[PDB]
Design an enzyme around this catalytic site. Structure first.
Site: not given
Ligand SMILES: CCCCCCCCCCCCCC(=O)SCCNC(=O)CCNC(=O)[C@H](O)C(C)(C)COP(=O)(O)OP(=O)(O)OC[C@H]1O[C@@H](n2cnc3c(N)ncnc32)[C@H](O)[C@@H]1OP(=O)(O)O
Ligand SMILES: CN(C)CCCN(C)c1nc(N(C)CCC#N)c2sc(C(C)(C)C)cc2n1
Ligand SMILES: [Mg+2]
Ligand SMILES: CN(C)CCCN(C)c1nc(N(C)CCC#N)c2sc(C(C)(C)C)cc2n1
Length: 411
Positions: A2, A4, A169, A411
């Site tokens: 990882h 990052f 990244r 959420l």
């Molecule tokens: C004190 C205040 C602190 C505030 C900050 C607190 C931390 C908050 C952290 C965020 C909390 C978010 C909560 C939510 O919103 S969870 C919902 C996340 N959103 C999605 O799944 C939407 C669809 N996917 C995407 O938009 C992209 O695939 C994302 C943006 C997720 C990654 O973009 P991409 O695929 O283009 O990758 P990269 O090349 O830029 O980056 C790769 C690096 O990113 C790490 N990665 C992948 N997915 C996640 C993930 N869900 N949380 C944390 N890290 C994640 C991954 O392990 C790798 O790191 P490493 O394995 O190399 O080390």
């Molecule tokens: C940040 N947040 C809390 C992201 C809630 C997204 N939501 C709405 C979410 N997410 C799911 N995940 C597995 C987490 C994906 C992520 N992140 C699922 S899996 C699911 C069933 C179809 C199996 C019932 C509903 C569902 N809903």
């Molecule tokens: Mg990227």
């Protein structure tokens, strides 16, 4: 493994997580003066943008990024479609900080490329009950109680990178800019959830789903007709019968929540959430914001008999785009939010949730096995789904807890 996450103040492995016995910070104590006001570096063709998430048009711009690029299944059948009204509600609670809403745009032409959002939450995140018992047994109660006071922290959600910019990244840079903006306001911890496994969750719960419109769910391939129903002459008729609900609530005195219910709902909710290790503390303004009904977004009902509110439930709406199909464009899902029961068993309260959600045209009710959600699964015909929600903290060491000791709905 990882590049990052190995650089950040989080527990690095399960083995490490096992050695954690007290709540507390991972990182060096720092001050706002130690944090630069200059934004984190970003390449010259991009720029940081702070959307105003109370302004219709900026909410709309973020809404389109998420509609087209946010979480989808692996077979690209469904992609979440959080509404504009939902985003304003989720991101602008009382005392929110506009600077915690962070976007990246391409500088030339202002194309929106990425987003991440933080909101304030007051969280109980002190040592959990089973580990305070261990502390008492070792004579270490002082250290275990150090961070018992609820803390004002950040909740992160809606991290999204445009599909054309994936695997470049950009998400790490988003996360470091967000961390800088939060740190500039003297906040040093965050809570976040994801489906994916990252270093390292403090709790994990499976998702559950309850069919409300099984004919549509089968049509769009959210569900299938289970094998056992093939023994019937009409499998679909028997599946519809299985999930049939009353057409009107069963609890005497159920009605929508109104502003005058805020003190009583705050009381019964906070009394209930206190029983769990990790959970939010809400003011009256926060109870108003997160629970008063909002069309298309959040639905909340109280049981009031004889002039006293004794129970309540809430659910919120997240539709999904149905990417492949021809009869249907949307999947309308209701998610179980906060609730509290003092007069009736939880299964009886949540049956009225399913009845109201079905009445209002929702197709499925979903939830994570947090709170006491496991207590009504079987009777109410929820089933476990193929998905989990993992709970993480940023810069907070925390012993592993069961999902039934988590009371924070994300959420
Ligand atoms: C004190 C205040 C602190 C505030 C900050 C607190 C931390 C908050 C952290 C965020 C909390 C978010 C909560 C939510 O919103 S969870 C919902 C996340 N959103 C999605 O799944 C939407 C669809 N996917 C995407 O938009 C992209 O695939 C994302 C943006 C997720 C990654 O973009 P991409 O695929 O283009 O990758 P990269 O090349 O830029 O980056 C790769 C690096 O990113 C790490 N990665 C992948 N997915 C996640 C993930 N869900 N949380 C944390 N890290 C994640 C991954 O392990 C790798 O790191 P490493 O394995 O190399 O080390
Ligand atoms: C940040 N947040 C809390 C992201 C809630 C997204 N939501 C709405 C979410 N997410 C799911 N995940 C597995 C987490 C994906 C992520 N992140 C699922 S899996 C699911 C069933 C179809 C199996 C019932 C509903 C569902 N809903
Ligand atoms: Mg990227
Ligand atoms: C590493 N992964 C992909 C774990 C996958 C978990 N996620 C994001 C997820 N998400 C889903 N949705 C977005 C459904 C609601 C919508 N949108 C679904 S819907 C689904 C079936 C019910 C069809 C089996 C599985 C699933 N899984």
């Amino acid at each position: 493994a990882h590049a990052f996450w190995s650089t950040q103040p989080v527990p690095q492995t399960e083995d490490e997580t096992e050695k954690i016995v007290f709540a507390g910070p991972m990182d060096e104590p720092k001050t706002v003066a130690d944090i630069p006001e200059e934004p984190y570096p970003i390449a010259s063709t991009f720029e940081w943008w702070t959307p105003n998430m109370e302004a219709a048009d900026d909410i709309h711009a973020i809404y389109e990024l998420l509609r087209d690029n946010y979480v989808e299944d692996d077979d690209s059948m469904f992609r979440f479609n959080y509404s504009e009204e939902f985003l304003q509600w989720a991101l602008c609670p009382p005392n929110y900080i506009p600077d915690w809403h962070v976007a990246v745009r391409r500088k030339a032409d202002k194309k929106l490329l990425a987003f991440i959002a933080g909101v304030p939450v007051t969280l109980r995140m002190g040592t959990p009950k089973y580990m305070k018992v261990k502390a008492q047994e070792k004579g270490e109660g002082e250290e275990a109680a150090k961070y018992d006071e609820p803390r004002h922290i950040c909740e992160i959600n809606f991290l999204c990178v445009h599909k054309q910019l994936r695997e470049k990244r950009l998400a790490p840079i988003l996360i470091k800019e967000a961390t800088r903006r939060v740190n500039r306001t003297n906040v040093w911890q965050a809570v976040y959830t994801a489906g994916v496994l990252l270093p390292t969750p403090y709790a994990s719960g499976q998702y559950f789903h309850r069919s409300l419109n099984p004919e549509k769910l089968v049509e769009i391939r959210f569900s299938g007709i289970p094998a056992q129903y093939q023994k019937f002459q009409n499998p679909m008729a028997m599946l519809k019968r299985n999930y049939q609900l009353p057409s009107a609530p069963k609890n005497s005195g159920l009605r929508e929540m109104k502003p005058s219910d805020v003190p009583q709902v705050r009381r019964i909710l906070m009394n209930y959430l206190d029983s769990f290790d990790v959970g939010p503390v809400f003011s009256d303004a926060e109870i108003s914001h997160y629970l008063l009904p909002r069309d298309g977004v959040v639905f909340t009902y109280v049981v009031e008999n004889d002039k006293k509110v004794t129970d309540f439930f809430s659910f919120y709406r997240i539709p999904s785009t149905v990417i492949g199909n021809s009869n249907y464009n949307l999947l309308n899902a209701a998610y179980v939010h906060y609730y509290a029961a003092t007069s009736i068993p939880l299964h009886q309260l949540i049956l009225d949730l399913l009845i109201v959600a079905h009445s209002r045209g929702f197709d499925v009710c979903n939830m994570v096995e947090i709170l006491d959600n496991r207590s009504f699964v079987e009777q109410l015909k929820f089933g476990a789904g193929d998905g989990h929600l993992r709970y993480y903290f940023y810069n907070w060491a925390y012993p592993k807890i069961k999902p039934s000791q988590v009371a924070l709905v994300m959420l």
